[PDB]
Each structure stands twice: as structure tokens, then as C-alpha cells.
Amino acid sequence: LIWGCELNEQNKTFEFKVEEKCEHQLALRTVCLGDKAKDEFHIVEIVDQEKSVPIATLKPSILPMATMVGIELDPPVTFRLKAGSGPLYISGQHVA
Amino acid sequence: DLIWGCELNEQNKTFEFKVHQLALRTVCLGDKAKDEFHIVEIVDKSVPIATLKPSILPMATMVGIELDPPVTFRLKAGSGPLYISGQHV
Amino acid sequence: LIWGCELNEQNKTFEFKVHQLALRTVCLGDKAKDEFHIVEIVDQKSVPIATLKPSILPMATMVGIELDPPVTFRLKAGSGPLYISGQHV
Amino acid sequence: DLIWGCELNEQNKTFEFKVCEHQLALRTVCLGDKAKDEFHIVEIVDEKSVPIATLKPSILPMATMVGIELDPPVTFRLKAGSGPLYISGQHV
Amino acid sequence: DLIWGCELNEQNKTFEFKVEHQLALRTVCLGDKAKDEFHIVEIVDQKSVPIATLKPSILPMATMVGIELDPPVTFRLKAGSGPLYISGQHV
């Protein structure tokens, strides 16, 4: 199944988790802005312990999405909107 | 192994791919699309997967996205033409 | 190994003529007019695969598009020169 | 498995990555939101420097790196620009 | 395996990768002083095949995926002044 989250200013941080192990990874597929996103740089980072790794920088009028290739993560994973108001959408898939 | 494609627009905001797996390859705008952000998502949960705008980014390459039918593509925003392309796999 | 064509305003078509073609990139030449070019794959019908435009996106990387002969490439919109590259797989 | 990243910027232009064996697979390069609006170039140093990415905030603020798998130690340097420029990768 | 690259420019429009082992291309990118014009790079099968078009204020680099090449190959700057840089790995 396809997975998605939305990061935005009210909800800057989203923790993806899990009812089974199983060992399934989350493979990122794309990151993309909503069409009422403010016209400013939006930066999405992966958080783990404190270290975060920026992985995408976007801006509506410059670069509104990015294709993610090869990123496979071990749950639990935390995504965070380091900069920007969003909506910023992340998509992915379950992988074995 | 052989090419598939759909078209979404204002009067056709949806396309069900029904009855193997679909590998997406590209999403791109037609040349008369209006100059606005277009968002296409997968519903089966709604998950956006591309945001495009003719004078900013008129296409994207999709990598790794392989889907089991049935899946519906929706144009969450924008009026199209927006084309999705892919391959049976 | 390496292969490519050139579609343009005279030559809108190129037929890849009968194992397997892996597209690599599609890119515009430096004198394409500044307009939307669209390239579709035609079958034995039609699936737009790249939208480009010199001052917006003048090339794209193709990933995962592997084709069985025959297949034809059409310059649906635009003057060209537009170049496709590929590799026999 | 675990995600890796580094920040190259004007103060710290060079970042040396050091570790049963394990390559570093790069995933993305991207600019910070206060980077100056100028071209940033990043290169791998081994002395021969090979540039791998050029970015600029108002033109192309990030890129996806595909297939670049490196054997430690690797050195990243900011050939141009002041950053922040962020690199992400995975142990593989 | 190991990192390879070359600089192509107006004075040196060609670079020949010379001789088992293929070259997997990774990126192409422009220098911060390239002029603001379309640069094109093609593989010369010595049919030259363009593989990239870039321009500093529109698109200053691109990611190559799946291009693996047997030497001898030659890369040619079909337009543009450069510096244009190409990167790759021996696979």
C-alpha cells in the first residue's frame, strides 16, 4: 500500500510507526508542496538521537517537488519541517 | 514490459486503473495547461505524489512507484492536461 | 551500447525498428524555440512521456523505461530539436 | 540502515566521512533556507577533486543523487558557495 | 567502486575515457562561472548522442541514471563554454 503524510506549520513533526514485526521498511517516493504553500523555502528533515538530516529543500516558484530514490528507512522514523509553512506531502511505500 | 498512460483534467479529474503491477514512469503537463499548480494523488487514504506548474516544473520522473490494482489517480488541484505514464510489470 | 534520435518539426517521428531499449534522457537543443515540447510513445496508441521547455526544464532523466520493438516516438508539440538517448538492454 | 548527513558551509568547507565493511550511498544534496543566492558546488576529494552537484536557491535548490556509492573515507568539499549545504546518505 | 570525473570547456571540448571495467555516469554539472547559455553533452560513438542540456539559470546540473558505458568513449561539449563537469564511477 501507498503511504503519505502531511507536514505543516501546525503539525511540523510526524512520527511514522508500525501491529507487527515483520521488519518492513518505509521507502520514500516523492516530496511535494500543496498549492497554497507560501512562496518560501520548505525543508524536510529526518530526526533521530539529537541529530537531524535535511533531505529535501523545496519552494513553490522554484522547485515544487522532488523524487526520492533509494531512501529506505527503518521504522520508527521522524520527519520534521525544519523551515516553511507547508503543506508539504511525503509519499512512500512499504517494502520487505 | 509495454507502455500505459492516462489523462486527467478538469472534466475528468479521476482515472481508475482496474484489472501484474503498474510501475509509474512520468507525470507531465500538456502544453495548453493553465499556469497553476497541479497536484495528482493516489486514492485507494489520499496521498499526493506530484506537484507541477508549467512555468516552474512541467514534469517529473517517478522512480520506484509500483502499484497493485485497483488504484485511482485524482487531480487534487489544477485543470490539466496532466498525463501519467507507466508500464505493466 | 549507446543510441539516440532527433525529433523536430520536419521529422516528428522516429521508429525504433525490430531485444530491448532502455531510455536514458530526453533533452532539447540550444535552438529549440522557447516553447513546450512534448514527446509521446506511440504503440501497435499514445502516451506522452516528457514535457520540456528551454527556459523552464530543458531536459529530463528517464528511469525504468524499457521498451520492446517496434515502438515509435512522436514529437506531439514543439519545434525541436529534441534528442532522446537510450541503450540496448 | 541509519540515515547519515553533513552540513558544508563557509566555516566548515570540508567534511571527511570515516567509519563489517559498508559503503556510503548518497541520497540527496540540498540548500538551507538562508543560503546566499549564489551557485554552490560540492565535490568529492580523493589530490583529485570531482564536482558532483551545483545548486542555487533561486534556480535549483536540491538534487537527488542516484547510484553514488562510496568507500570510506570520503571527503566532501564545498568548492563554491557559502552554504549551508546539506548532504544526506545511508550506510550500505 | 571508485570516483571519476572530467572538466569539458571551450578550449577542451573533448575528453576521452580510455581503457573488464565500465564507467557508470552519475552527474553532470556546470561551474559557477559558466556563461549563461545552453550547454550540451553528447557521447561520441567513434552518431554522436546528446545526453544532457543544462543552463546555469534554468538547470545547472542533472542526475544520470543507468548510463553504463564500455570504453573507449568520448564526451563532447556540443555547445557551451563550460566549465561542465561530468562524474562517474568504474563499475
From TrEMBL, chain B:
Residues annotated as domain Nucleoplasmin core? 3-89
Q: Which compartment or compartments is the protein found in?
A: Nucleus
Q: What protein family does this chain belong to?
A: Belongs to the nucleoplasmin family.
Q: What does this protein do?
A: Acts as a chaperone for histones, such as histone H2A-H2B, and thus regulates the assembly of nucleosome cores. Involved in chromatin remodeling, especially during fertilization and early embryonic development. May be involved in sperm chromatin decondensation during fertilization.
The entry's protein name is Nucleoplasmin
Organism encoding this protein? Xenopus laevis
Residue span relative to the full protein: 16 to 118 of 200
